From a paper:
Exonuclease I (Exo I) from E. coli is an Mg2+ ion dependent exonuclease, which specifically degrades single-stranded DNA (ssDNA) from 3' to 5' in a highly processive manner. It is involved in several important DNA repair systems in E. coli, such as RecBCD-dependent homologous recombination, methyl-dependent mismatch repair, and genomic tandem repeat maintenance. According to the two-metal ion mechanism, two magnesium ions are essential for exonuclease activity, with MgB binding directly to the enzyme and MgA binding via the 3' end of the bound ssDNA substrate. The results of activity assays and sequence alignment indicate MszExo I is an E. coli Exo I homolog in Methylocaldum szegediense.
The overall structure adopted a doughnut-like shape with a large groove through the center of the molecule, closely resembling E. coli Exo I. The N-terminal exonuclease domain (residues 1–197) is located in the middle of the molecule. It is flanked by the SH3-like domain (residues 198–355) and C-terminal helical region (residues 356–479). Residues at active site and anchor site, both of which are involved in substrate binding, are highly conserved among MszExo I and E. coli Exo I. A single magnesium ion (MgB) was observed at the active site, coordinated by Asp11 and Asp104. Glu13 and Asp182 are predicted to bind the other magnesium ion (MgA), which was not present in the crystal structure probably due to the absence of substrate.
Residue numbers in the entry: 4 to 173, 176 to 349, 357 to 479
């Protein structure tokens, strides 16, 4: 008895690690994509160490004042989301959620004393994202769907362009985005049900690994944001090695690129070119066409035999050339080891991926969360993980500031102000940039009345937050 929970954030900036959520929209559906129960819509009050990015507030229309006025404390905000997410059998899905919104969720759970991952895998739960399914559909079975292009003819998967081009539309608040996501998913399910079921059924770690055929040197299709839109985000790849550090990474080679440099260079030169940003490569030297597949992120892979002859022709795929390159790679006994060889703080808010929680810590965290604000002030717990002490403090200071001692309040105030004002103290943006970016935006000739009010609100928020 499983369900799909579709969601989206509007946030105060584009850095999931540092910029906090402002709005959440959620809609649960059955596996037919028909809604169950009511949509959820929540605002999150910004804690008093938050400085939003001006441009984001203009795009969303959401000021810190609006969020404070209509929202919940972050603890309750995330607890209500966590409730919906952790209902057994729930697959939590969205549109580009895995590489953005889910990171916002992980960091938010983390700060608020939840395990960042349990909602993703316990009690039959899982994740999904439709963006790579759409990339595969457009690349491999585009029939029956209008694939929009922008003004200069470049391909676009933007939610609004896609929905209008296919006549399933009906502004950018989170709720409209979520409903448009569900509708786009329905459209794929209707026009290409077999692909839809293939991608969905194969979305998990185990199943994605199996599709890679590691290590039979079998070429497969892989779609990714990292491959060029001019090639429909698709490449013919082969899995060559497990990633040295990331246990969920498999490194794959784009068989359209001459592998001579990968074969000929030593481990030192290979590491060098592989860590040189493409912009900084010398002239005549292209990049090493290796790419990491993150098995835990619902990567989309299909067998080479999914190509019909019109698809190969349409995608301008040279199978012989790929085969020729594959032959050369099969001959190198040492290549996997060489690849693995070539590929090899402080702030608790920035240390989510520094290590996993123990079973013990998880238990004390749960107990602390069950307490009332008063009980929580008296707790005096003991942690195995070194990150949790300071982390517990900020959680109390942000959501329950009336619960602090006089000297605790002075500690919060020192941290709070220097996060708001000094570079590298947690925030993506500090007060002076915030004001400078407000100035830049104020100088433009094409501000709406609404834009001005928002920029006015932002000035007032900065004035108020430092007093
Ligand atoms: Mg979104």
């Amino acid at each position: 008895c499983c369900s799909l929970y579709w969601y989206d954030y509007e946030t105060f900036g584009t850095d999931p690690r540092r910029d906090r959520p402002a709005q959440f929209a959620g809609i649960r559906t059955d596996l037919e994509l028909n809604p169950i129960g009511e949509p959820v819509t929540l605002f999150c009050k910004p804690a008093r160490d938050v400085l939003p990015v001006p441009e984001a507030c203009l795009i969303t229309g959401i000021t810190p004042q609006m969020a404070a006025e209509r929202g919940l404390k972050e603890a309750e905000f995330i607890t209500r989301i966590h409730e919906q997410f952790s209902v057994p059998g729930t697959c939590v899905a969205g549109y580009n959620n895995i590489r953005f919104d889910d990171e916002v969720t992980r960091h938010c759970l983390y700060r608020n004393l939840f395990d960042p991952y349990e909602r993703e895998w316990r009690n039959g739960n899982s994740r999904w994202d439709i963006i790579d399914m759409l990339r595969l559909t457009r690349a491999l079975r585009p029939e029956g769907i209008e694939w929009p292009v922008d003004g200069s003819g470049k391909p676009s998967l933007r939610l609004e362009a896609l929905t209008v081009a296919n006549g399933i539309q009906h502004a950018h608040d989170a709720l409209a985005d979520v409903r448009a996501t569900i509708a786009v998913a329905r459209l794929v399910r209707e026009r290409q049900p077999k692909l839809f079921n293939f991608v969905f059924a194969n979305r998990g770690k185990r199943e994605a690994f199996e599709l890679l055929r590691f290590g039979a040197m079998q070429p497969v299709l892989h779609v990714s944001e990292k491959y060029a839109s001019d090639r429909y985000c698709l490449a013919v790849v082969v899995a060559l090695a497990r990633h040295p550090r990331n246990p969920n990474g498999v490194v794959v080679y784009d068989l359209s690129v001459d592998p001579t440099p990968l074969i000929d260079l030593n481990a030192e030169d290979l590491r060098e070119r592989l860590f040189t940003p493409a912009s900084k490569l010398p002239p005549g030297v292209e990049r090493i066409a290796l790419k990491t597949v993150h098995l835990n992120k619902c990567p989309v892979i299909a067998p080479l035999t999914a190509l019909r002859s019109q698809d190969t022709e349409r995608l301008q795929i040279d199978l012989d050339r790929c085969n020729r390159h594959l032959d050369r790679l099969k001959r190198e006994w040492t290549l996997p080891k060489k690849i693995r060889e070539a590929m090899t703080t402080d702030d608790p808010d920035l240390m989510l991926y520094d290590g996993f929680l123990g079973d013990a810590d998880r238990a004390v965290l749960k107990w602390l969360r069950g307490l009332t604000p008063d009980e929580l002030a008296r707790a005096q717990p003991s942690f195995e993980d070194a990150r949790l002490p300071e982390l517990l403090f900020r959680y109390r200071a942000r959501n329950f500031p009336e619960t602090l001692t006089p000297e605790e309040t002075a500690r919060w105030e020192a941290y709070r102000i220097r996060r708001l004002t000094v570079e590298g103290c947690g925030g993506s943006i500090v007060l002076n940039e915030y004001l400078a970016r407000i100035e830049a935006l104020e100088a433009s000739p094409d501000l709406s009345a609404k834009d001005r009010e928002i920029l006015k609100n932002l000035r007032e928020y900065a004035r108020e937050i430092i007093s």
